[PDB]
Amino acid sequence: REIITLQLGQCGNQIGFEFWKQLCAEHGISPEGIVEEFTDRKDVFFYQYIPRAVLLRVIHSILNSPYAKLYGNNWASGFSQGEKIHEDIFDIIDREADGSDSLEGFVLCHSIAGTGSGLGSYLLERLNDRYPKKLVQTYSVFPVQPYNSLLTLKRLTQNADCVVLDNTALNRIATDRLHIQSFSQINQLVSTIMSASTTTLRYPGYMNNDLIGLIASLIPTPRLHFLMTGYTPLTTVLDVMRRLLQPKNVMVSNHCYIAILNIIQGEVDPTQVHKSLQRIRERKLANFIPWGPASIQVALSRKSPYLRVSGLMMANHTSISSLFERTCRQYDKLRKREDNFDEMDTSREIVQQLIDEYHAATRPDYIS
């Protein structure tokens, strides 16, 4: 199986370029795409080595960097221009998909705030229509700005089969424990999460060896497909498992979890893992849905020898609905302040359905 990544807009290319820089170093691959001398599965992302990337002004900064050997602001303008080059950009993907052994997914790195907002919404509709069996995971990044923010939200709630990273929680963590006061400094933090998000697809493990294994575990219902991240070390597994549940680390600005996935990338002791989960159940640090039986999953991994204990948390929290109300509320305030303008309210209608879908998920009778 393979995964082809797509990078749209200025935000996509940079956080994508920093994603490949971190991964090329994790593996024994020199910046000129030559293996250095100095067991890790590298066929999923690299093609025998060349990354399976599709980049879409900022391109010149990449071509002048030492990594050259490795390859408007209205949402309507972004959607329109994609319609004009439909066959052009779909000719580099078709060969990228066909030439692949057995395609599995389409990782998308973009921010919903201008062209990547529109051109991103356009490709998301074409992708599902062209292939219905291909997963589309999108590493969206949250910030006329309120309009374009919810328009893509309409497309992300029916097209994308699965991770939010909001800049507000990025700015707060930056000033708190990193002392930045800068785009080039926050990107070092997001790329650390991305390279850690797929740490179970670059190393042959016991379970979660496929992209559909990470997705179907968390997402119970195709509407509730928004996840958040947690990454503590910026020692036993109990210390890491407790620090991840602190809201000071969750990258999100009643309420309960639906399913949690913990990633431990260290050399920790494999028998004490059940002991930590036991004390979590006693102290009751996390609450879950009352309707369906939900559990917490923890998986170990092995760090690359060429490139200490870390930990990442992937969870499906109902509190993510709060972020949508902020985008939703700001829209109505702009709708009273200023061909048919009917595409917006349809988007406004469908996003409200998800919000009510979330608030009804935390009830003991969410079914029907």
């Binding site: 001398e37 100095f38 020898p305 060429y306």
Partner: protein, 354 residues
């Protein structure tokens, strides 16, 4: 049994006193991942996944942590003995810093708890192996002309030449590549083999070059994957660098360096001229003895009697000399005992091993 350990810049030789040859020989290398430490042949075999260290690269120990690991390897892996149960005779390079001698002593008694130990200069042991106590002696892998009188090396007249086997191997890779082949990769091991098997020292460089240029009489074949290659004037051009270092961009040859004699008291120079002994792997080239004889004769007074001694077993004469020494009746009183070490400390080595 007493142990004899010859610490070489490239290869260590270890065995038991009394034996005619070392029981083990291995690379003076320690490697760690890019089992936590690898030493000897294994480090070399798995160099692909390791970062190699050469703690005695030029004859002098530069990293004691890894040298300790080489000694640990020597006792437990190679010889399969417990050092606390056997006296140990160790070898050292000429002009070895006094502080290093004390360090070696302290490590043997405090880290390995040896019941007894001693340290002797490599060149001196080789001279002993030839049945002499006076003469001038050593070309190894990473690095001497050592005048010795009555068993004592004369430090003021010792000369060091940073030109040895390693440099010759790399030079051969270079000229074979210039010939049209391509030996550049850590291929270095293959060329080292070609060097040890087909090279020789020409009696007269120019005449030999003329012969090779006008005929194929000096050519030899070498088989790699089956490919058979041809080695011509490279056979003797390689070791010629010992006599003319400029071929390597270095500003004196071994004959001229063997200057050491002239630095000695005039009264013992004739003894040195008449007893010039060759030792070390890099002196194994066929024809080297006759070439040295010719070159030294040209430098020395016409009335001087010149004699070059090239023992067939000179590649291991250092170790053999140690085996002989440690086996001598009169040498038993010379060992530094654990008792003496406890009494005087590391500095006793200067008095006991003069």
């Amino acid at each position: 049994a007493a142990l004899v350990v010859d610490n070489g810049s490239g290869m260590c030789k270890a065995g038991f006193a009394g034996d005619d040859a070392p029981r083990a020989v291995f690379p003076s290398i320690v490697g760690r991942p890019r089992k936590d430490s690898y030493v000897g042949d294994e480090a070399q075999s798995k160099r692909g996944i390791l970062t190699l260290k050469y703690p005695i690269e030029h004859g002098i120990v530069t990293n004691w942590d890894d040298m300790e690991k080489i000694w640990h390897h020597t006792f437990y892996n190679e010889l399969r003995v417990a050092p606390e149960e056997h006296p140990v005779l160790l070898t050292e390079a000429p002009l070895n810093p006094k502080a290093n001698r004390e360090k070696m002593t302290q490590i043997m008694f405090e880290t390995f708890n040896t019941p007894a130990m001693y340290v002797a200069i490599q060149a001196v042991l080789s001279l002993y192996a030839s049945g002499r106590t006076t003469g001038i002696v050593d070309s190894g892998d990473g690095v001497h002309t050592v005048p010795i009188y009555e068993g004592y090396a004369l430090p003021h007249a010792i000369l060091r030449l940073d030109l040895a086997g390693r440099d010759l191997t790399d030079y051969l890779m270079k000229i074979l590549t210039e010939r049209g082949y391509s030996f550049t990769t850590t291929e270095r091991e293959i060329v080292r083999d070609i060097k040890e098997k087909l090279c020789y020292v020409a009696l007269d460089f120019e005449q030999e070059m003329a012969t090779a240029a006008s005929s194929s009489s000096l050519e030899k074949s070498y088989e790699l994957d089956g490919q058979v290659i041809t080695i011509g004037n490279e056979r003797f051009r390689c070791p010629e660098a010992l006599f003319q270092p400029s071929f390597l961009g270095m500003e004196c040859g071994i004959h001229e360096t063997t200057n050491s004699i002239m630095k000695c008291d005039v009264d013992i120079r004739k003894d040195l001229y008449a007893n010039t002994v060759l030792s070390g792997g890099t002196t194994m080239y066929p024809g080297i003895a006759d070439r040295m004889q010719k070159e030294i004769t040209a430098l020395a007074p016409s009335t001087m009697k010149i004699k070059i001694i090239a023992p067939p077993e000179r590649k291991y004469s250092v170790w053999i000399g140690g085996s002989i020494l440690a086996s001598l009746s009169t040498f038993q009183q010379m060992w530094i005992s654990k008792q003496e070490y406890d009494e005087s400390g590391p500095s006793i080595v200067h008095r006991k091993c003069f």
